Write a protein that binds this DNA or RNA. Sequence first.
RNA 1: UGGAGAGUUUGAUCCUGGCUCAGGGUGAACGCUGGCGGCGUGCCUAAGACAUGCAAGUCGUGCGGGCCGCGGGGUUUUACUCCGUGGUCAGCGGCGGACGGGUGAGUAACGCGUGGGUGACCUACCCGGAAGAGGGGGACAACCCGGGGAAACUCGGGCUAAUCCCCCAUGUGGACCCGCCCCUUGGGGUGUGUCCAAAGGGCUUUGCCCGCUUCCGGAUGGGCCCGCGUCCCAUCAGCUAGUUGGUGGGGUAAUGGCCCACCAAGGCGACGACGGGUAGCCGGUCUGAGAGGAUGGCCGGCCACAGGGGCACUGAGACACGGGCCCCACUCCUACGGGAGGCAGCAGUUAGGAAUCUUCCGCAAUGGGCGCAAGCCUGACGGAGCGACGCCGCUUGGAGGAAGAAGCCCUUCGGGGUGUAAACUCCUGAACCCGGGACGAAACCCCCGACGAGGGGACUGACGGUACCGGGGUAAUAGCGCCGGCCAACUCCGUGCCAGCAGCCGCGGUAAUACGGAGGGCGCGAGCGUUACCCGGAUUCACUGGGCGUAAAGGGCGUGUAGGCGGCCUGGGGCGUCCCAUGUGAAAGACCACGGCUCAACCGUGGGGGAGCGUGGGAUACGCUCAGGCUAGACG
Lengths: 83, 184, 208, 99, 59, 99
Amino acid sequence: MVKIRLARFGSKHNPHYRIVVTDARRKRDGKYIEKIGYYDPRKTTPDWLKVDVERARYWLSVGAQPTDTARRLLRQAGVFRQE
Amino acid sequence: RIRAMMDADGNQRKEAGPGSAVQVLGFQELPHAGDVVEWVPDLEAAKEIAEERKEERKAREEEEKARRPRTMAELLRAMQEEGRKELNLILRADTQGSLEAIQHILARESTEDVKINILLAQVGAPTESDVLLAQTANAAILAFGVNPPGSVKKKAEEKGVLLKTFRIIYDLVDEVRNMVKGQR
Amino acid sequence: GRYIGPVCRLCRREGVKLYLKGERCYSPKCAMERRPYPPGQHGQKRARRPSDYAVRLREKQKLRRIYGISERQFRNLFEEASKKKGVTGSVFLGLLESRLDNVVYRLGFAVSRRQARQLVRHGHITVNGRRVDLPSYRVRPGDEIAVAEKSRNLELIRQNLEAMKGRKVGPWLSLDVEGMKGKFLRLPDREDLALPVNEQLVIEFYSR
Amino acid sequence: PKKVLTGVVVSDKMQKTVTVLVERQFPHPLYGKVIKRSKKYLAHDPEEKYKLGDVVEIIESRPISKRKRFRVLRLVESGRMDLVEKYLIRRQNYESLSK
Amino acid sequence: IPGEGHNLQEHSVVLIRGGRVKDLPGVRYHIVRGVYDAAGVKDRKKSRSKYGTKKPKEA
Amino acid sequence: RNLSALKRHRQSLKRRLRNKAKKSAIKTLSKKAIQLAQEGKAEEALKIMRKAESLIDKAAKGSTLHKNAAARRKSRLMRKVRQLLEAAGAPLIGGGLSA
RNA sequence: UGGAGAGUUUGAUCCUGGCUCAGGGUGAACGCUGGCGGCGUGCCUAAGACAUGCAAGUCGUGCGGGCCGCGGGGUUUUACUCCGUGGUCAGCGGCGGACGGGUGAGUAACGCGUGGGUGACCUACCCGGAAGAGGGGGACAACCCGGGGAAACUCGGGCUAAUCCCCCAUGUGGACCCGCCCCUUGGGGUGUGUCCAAAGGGCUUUGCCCGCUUCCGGAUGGGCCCGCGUCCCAUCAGCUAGUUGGUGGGGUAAUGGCCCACCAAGGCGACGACGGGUAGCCGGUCUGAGAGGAUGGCCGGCCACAGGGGCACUGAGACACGGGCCCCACUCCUACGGGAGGCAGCAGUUAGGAAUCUUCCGCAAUGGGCGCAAGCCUGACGGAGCGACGCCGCUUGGAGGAAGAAGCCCUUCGGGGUGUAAACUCCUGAACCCGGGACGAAACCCCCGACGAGGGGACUGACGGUACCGGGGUAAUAGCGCCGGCCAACUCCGUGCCAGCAGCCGCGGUAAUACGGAGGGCGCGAGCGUUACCCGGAUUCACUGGGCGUAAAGGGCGUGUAGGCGGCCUGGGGCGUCCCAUGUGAAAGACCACGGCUCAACCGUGGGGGAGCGUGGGAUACGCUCAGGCUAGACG
Ligand SMILES: [Zn+2]
């Protein structure tokens, strides 16, 4: 299936995560469909995490089933919140 | 570093106290028989100690070696022109505590006109390098307790070098007694 | 690692004053004045005509010594300069200057470049809040260096300040002599620095 | 957009099959000069409606045989057999230089 | 064999450098001194690295 | 040695057997239908064909033929039967045929 | 935004021209030397053998069963029993084991790269919607007994559940033949006829949750086919017999010579087939002014193989790395009849070999799988260990301080050198010890809100007591190469065509700026040099940008085929060619900008560029092509 998931890049002890859309059976670094956002765990930057919302929503609609952490991140950003 | 310890009963041992025979795996080189095993705080220190030991031994060995072809005018000539022909042999045993014994036994067995020579004596399996060496030197490969590897054996067979495999020391000794010959 | 070892020998080798001690390298003592010739035996000998390569090499060495850096680092800096657009020599020089130690030296925080570097290393030098201990720190313009909180009451620093009390600073620099502060303002151009080095020669040397 | 090609019917020697010479003029990746370079394609003609010496439009298609992956779209112009003749001559020459 | 007098035996274990010699016919290889059975050149003090001899103990 | 994936193999064996039962029987039925069609028995033949079709569908439903393969098979059978019927018969029961 | 040459055939010159060298780099290695820290990275050899440990399972919210445990009895006890249970243990049943991880032998091929196509197709799980889920039957493990067999294991009889299987009913639908319609290859719609559905558990149970069955729509994942690009050898010239096409059928999810029957006799080839060798391919990397040239390590994709070969089974997906069967090879036991194996998973063992790490800790983060969930699993991964194997960062002090100690070295005997170097004064304070001490980890979980959004709660650390901060606190490893010209830097002693050096010219046969040492210098520096390969210089394969009277080089000429190439004018077409637009050209890198780790490496964010390739439009000068004419070429 298709998942919204976090791809580790970066350095040892300096992790960086790509909030990304990809197939379930892939390398956690692998050929992903689209880069929707990015997240730094270490909170080192002011704009530490950011995801484009509309694209994410579209993906969800299509049926992109997110990872739990990813979902949390999305919620934090303001994707799942509706009015 | 200690990888595995295994008693004579045939059981895996994680912990071994004072006074039990353990099959200790984890030494980078094959240590000598009756060598005192010692504990170290770290690895670097151990390495340093080893280096120091090597320095102590090796330098001395070198020195010992160096006081042999002293005169090269006449003495060298005497030592290059050899009357009694020598037979070369290269041994490979199963343990450190048998190879030495074998050597001791065959050092006596040298009174004949043909004088036996050990060029390479190590414990373990024969290989293609050994075969190559034999070819270079005209030497025999003798084995006690260790069977030859298939490839190695094949190589030995086809290239035309003396390959030997044994069960008893006595057998080996007997075999050696045939190698001096007589021509007449 | 540093050069480390005999200093004014290098100066002697070039034949132009290199100011690698500060004082004494100012007085009749840098060995430029007492003796002006290259070190070791054939220094006082007949000076032979040097090859085209050689002159350039000498110049490069002079430069490196003046800035007190490892060769690899220097090379890297040069490469970076080349990559960036402008005047590959002047820009390079500016970049070199931007090395924290050099800046410190300029601001009169320490009387010698090596000394400055040492000071920087030993947490005595602060760049906008944090004590920075690596002289390879490159400072981008409009930025504040200061003598550290707990190093403000040490004798050497005071002496340095006194020395630089009265005598003015470079146009790319400003220093608060009261509170042991020093802003690096402009990025130092070549025209500002009346250095004995010719960058062109260095560039040529590098080329092949 | 299926691959649509221009070429001449060089051989009708088989049932339902037309052989088509497609000549492509591409420049050399290094020397910058155009090479008039040909390739043979075996095309499906369900009627034998097309004949020796016809220039036709050949469409990339779902396969009908092992290297017969082309449908014949339409006939462009019929009777410029000169090219065909040239090809034949070339083929004949190819026979010559064996032994 | 580079070095002021070899140590090499008749069934000596060696390591080969390669890199020609302009004098010698059929010969394209240096023997690298300081390994296996080719021990370091005794009483070298300047160009030790090429000939594999250890640092001398100074007084 | 030894892993709990032997279970899977065992399962597959059983499934294989069931699949074989489904498939071989279906094939046999098809053959029978064809034979019936051969001479022109029609009504019984039609019934047999229908039965075969049903079996095929069942197989598809389970984990045997599946997908469009079953459909293809049906088409192959049915068309063949129809062709055979052209040599005497015509739809007597109504049955598998579209009349 | 970018391009250095030089030494050398000679008595000297000019060239032609090879060789050699500086430059940079490597998955390197070796030698000497060796403080740390960050980060990257480490069998390039035998795809040789492999131990040991682990590397893939999980669901009791699918189901029966054994072993135990409890709460309570029925049970005097003992049973047996009943549930709630707590775990286990194995079985069935399902989902995953086709992902992840490795290696690069083969394969020079639609294998890949690339741009399309698929009216010739699949897609379990995911989401979107639609419609359902009515009844009845059955076997099979486990289990019990009974054997056979040394073991591996295994056959026989019986029992039993279930989301296992079957059968009937319904039909939203779909499946198929036939017809019709619209399309245009098998796409969509419809009619008659035939065929096809399913299955349940969970509770806060009259209510929802998870699952279910059929379908269409999507989503991703592919399968298959084609356009072009894809190493050397012409001393490999003809290759082909399912081979090239057809008709029919089989087989496939689907086309097709994939396979078979039958008919036809083709098909490919010098625009390089077939054959041999070589080689995974690329995104890239290294180099280079660029064009190119070499390479494909790590990282990312794709392929291919899991001792060699062959083949199926099960499923959404394998011809299946830690499944199966079979033959062979080999290792391992055998009660000689037979089985067990497979590290190209991590670690490790050997063996080859110049050479390559730890039988490490962890599920904490991310991701995987299963699961309602907790949670279980995870040698993916996160990290730590070792190696100066790369790259970067810092230390080995700083400030004084002789018209110049000693030591050593030369000297023309005055002196010079080492050298402000040292000693010595002053100052700082890596190491080091204490004191603290992380970011990374806020969620899934619970409760309130409807199990939605939203609100609060709590736990959760391998790294690691590490990084890092606060206090203290020692002056605290310098080595290697070279020093005749290239080429930076020179003297003396010793040696006497010897010993030696050398990459090249060549140095050495008694005053050697080339050998050994010493001083002195110079280059770099925790490194430096040697070796090996690659590029560069090498415009020494020349497209940019070489030449061929005499240097290497014009075939001995003729005619002539392919091929290549082409006069002038006018008009079209618009293939090349240009352009505009768009789509692609993934990410990582490379480039620019900013930002994080005290800097830098490293990394992150954003941006631009980017040959090429498709699609749509345009342009017609120049090729190409068609048409018409001309007379300068050519022919008569
Ligand atoms: Zn000075």
